[PDB]
Amino acid sequence: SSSKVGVKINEWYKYIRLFSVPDSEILKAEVEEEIRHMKEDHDLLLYYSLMCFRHQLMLDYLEPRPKISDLLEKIESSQTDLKGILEYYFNFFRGMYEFEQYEYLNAISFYKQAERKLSLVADEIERAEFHYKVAEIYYHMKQTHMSMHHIVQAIDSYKAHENYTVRVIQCSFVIGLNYLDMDYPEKAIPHFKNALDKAREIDMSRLIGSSLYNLGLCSFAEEAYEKASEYFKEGIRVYQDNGYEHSNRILDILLMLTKTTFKMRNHSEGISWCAHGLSLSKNLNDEIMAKMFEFIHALYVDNDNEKLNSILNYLELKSMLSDVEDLASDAAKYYNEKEDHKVAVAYYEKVLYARKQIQR
């Protein structure tokens, strides 16, 4: 009855990828009943601990000493003599975790280890998971061509099956966001409106609001800040009216709305938005998002270029060059309007430096 547990853990992972929580809870229960009467295969035990971890990552996406850091504890104490697909799962899942912690280098390191084992992965849907997650981190690193390379592979496999809508939406996010990085907002809007339509079909509040956020990033790119300010606002109430008011990623939408309202020269409204966003980053214990709201504040409110510089260095040390570029670009532009062309030059150069670093 040892393969009987392995088969059930596979089924468990099938349902996790399908975002069927009721089935995932059914399989997790059956597995835990089965482990009671099995004979301590340490690999089977680790397969179980990895699936628990992956199951928890699903649950934390759908609803935000957490169960996760306790589960991650169990995983690293048994990283001894790994081989085959279990080693692949180990590194893939570990890279996922590290990505959610803003540990981009760690995550890419883990993902590269998993990638070496890709030929062991018979399941096409499993390979698609890998390609999507890899594409995602490449996008966050502004590795646009690498991201596009992986994301096409994933979304082709997902679209070849049926109930992978959630992943298909997310792949549409990645592709669209890549086209944006290439200054094609008009090429990116189709993919986001497509995602928006599918997310309303399955009534996923999170995905709906992230579509608005991604669409607002287009208007913002087209300097249509009115329309951009709308998209951001509605996506924020989406997250808030549906139990996502404490998801870290709402800070993204707050941050860009704060930027947009300041660019609309609605100074006072812009203050009542950087505010909610500064305190929320404090509350959710996200140092990286807090320091991006500081940058906005020090820029449009304070002109404390010194702090601006200190934040830019921080974000570079954090391997978030894309945010370095975007923020230095906000600074450079704003000072250009204020005709402080001298220091406006300083930030234009920083933009050049970040763009160069991204290319290496």
Binding site: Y61, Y139, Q170, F173, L177, L180, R249, D252, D323
Partner: peptide, 6 residues
């Protein structure tokens, strides 16, 4: 800011 990819 990066778009939402998840």
């Amino acid at each position: 800011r990066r778009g939402h990819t998840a």
